[PDB]
Amino acid sequence: KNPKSDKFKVKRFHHIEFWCGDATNVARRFSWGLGMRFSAKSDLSTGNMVHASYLLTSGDLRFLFTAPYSPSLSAGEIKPTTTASIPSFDHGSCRSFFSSHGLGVRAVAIEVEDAESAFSISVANGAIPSSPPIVLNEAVTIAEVKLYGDVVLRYVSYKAFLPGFERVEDASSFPLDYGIRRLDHAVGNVPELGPALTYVAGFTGFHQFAESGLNSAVLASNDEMVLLPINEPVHGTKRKSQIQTYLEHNEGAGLQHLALMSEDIFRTLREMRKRSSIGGFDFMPSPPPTYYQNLKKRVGDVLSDDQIKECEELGILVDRDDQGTLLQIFTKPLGDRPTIFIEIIQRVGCMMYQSGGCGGFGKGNFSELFKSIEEYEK
């Protein structure tokens, strides 16, 4: 059931912002590793004396990487005279975030009809304010509220990337593309799922979409294209909860993984794996061949034996709903700490356009992986 109780009009995921120590090196690494174009910049060369911000795009997916300059460069500025292109930015908040959490996601940004309204209604409904609505060049409105930990949910609305960003000069912009097209979901880890759900569902109106080490639940907008899973750990097992491991290494709640939809997960994974050891991303260990011997009995009617064999060479996981089928794979952590990672996903089914969440999120793969592991010991 979908009660469609959004308290404001939400469109789609708009971008994800990483707070970095050096935005240049993270952005260049992510560009090569994921096949994302350099699309826009805001830095010293555009008059920004506050922060260096670089935007990567792939289809509708937008990754923003931001780091602070020396405060001395903008010491004479005040907020009314700021050269920062993102007015919520703050040297102290950014340095504190990164020193506390390491590299990771500061902002999950969704495009809304009216960011000022979305902010007001959110706050009137319990949201903790983080940065008030600010109108940029009479064209774009941006506002922020707290989501969990030091992660903010950012509202952006357009009358018509951001004012103050310049499009990147073609020579600097190499048209890489490995098939990734949009953000499918963004998953938070928190110490207690209950109050996190109540808080976020409280101020958005998002509805519940619906051995492990976790409990979770998914909040979703009216059309279920903005999907916001939240995990909590389950304590006292045999293998320690990776949710609890995250909270310890991350110094508290934060974003656990971004799942990126590919229009062709086989080409994406071929392209990403060729680059794993030459600056790109590493993938988690492949499941045993028992896992793939068991795929015929589960998805033999959705995927041919050749497509199943192709999942096997690439290390791809498969799970299935009552409504659809899902291909997924997981990278190793994106940075030094065992915290944030990326998932590549592709959904087959639920044609009407494709409805969101088609096939679920792979929860069946926990049981399926364990049961392939001990039966591969054989």
Ligand X SMILES: CCC[S@@](=O)c1c(C(F)(F)F)ccc(C(=O)Nc2nnc(C)o2)c1F
The site for ligand X (CB under 6 A) is made up of: 185, 187, 216, 218, 229, 284, 317, 330, 343, 361-362, 365-366, 369
Give the whole-angstrom CA distance, residue 285 versus residue 289: 12
Residue 265, interface with Co ion (CB under 5 A)?
no
Q: Structure tokens of 309?
A: 């064999």
**Residue 313 touching a second copy (CB under 8 A):** no
Q: Work out what residue 282 binds among Co ion, a second copy, ligand X, none; the CB cut-off runs from 5 to 8 Å by kind.
A: a second copy
Amino acid, res. 120? S
32 interacts with, out of ligand X, Co ion, a second copy, none, CB within 5 to 8 A per kind: a second copy
Whether 169 has a binding-site annotation, put simply, is: no
Contact letters (x/-) for a second copy, 99-128, by CB under 8 A? xx-xx-------------------------
Judged by CB under 8 A, does residue 137 bind a second copy? no
State the CB neighbour count (10 A cutoff) for residue 61: 21
Q: Tell me, what amino acid is at 102?
A: G
Which string of x and - marks every residue 73-102 that binds a second copy (by CB under 8 A)?
Answer: x---------------------x--xxx-x
Query: Which of a second copy, Co ion, ligand X, none has residue 365 at its interface (CB below 5 to 8 Å by kind)?
Result: ligand X
C-beta of residue 328 within 8 angstroms of C-beta of residue 343:
yes
284-287, long-range: CB within 8 Å, 24+ apart, which pairs? 284/315, 284/329, 284/330, 284/331, 284/332, 285/315, 286/315, 287/315, 287/317, 287/369, 287/372, 287/373
β pairing state of 317-320 and 324-330: antiparallel
Amino acid at 347: R
Q: Is 186 left (phi over 0), alpha (psi -120 to 50) or beta?
A: beta
Q: Contact region for Co ion (CB under 5 A) — 190-198, 284-292, 308-316, 354-362?
A: 354-362
Regarding 288 and contact with a second copy (CB under 8 A), the answer is no
- Of 38, 178, 206, 246, which lies in the binding site for a second copy, with binding defined by CB under 8 A? 38
**265: Cβ–Cβ under 8 A, 6 or more apart, which residues?**
179, 316, 327, 329, 344, 345, 346
Interacting residues toward a second copy by CB under 8 A: 20-26, 28-33, 38, 43-44, 52, 67, 69-70, 72-73, 95, 98-100, 102-103, 171-174, 176, 248-251, 277-280, 282, 334-338
Residues making up the binding site for Fe cation = 185, 257, 343
Interacting residues toward Co ion by CB under 5 A: 259, 343, 361
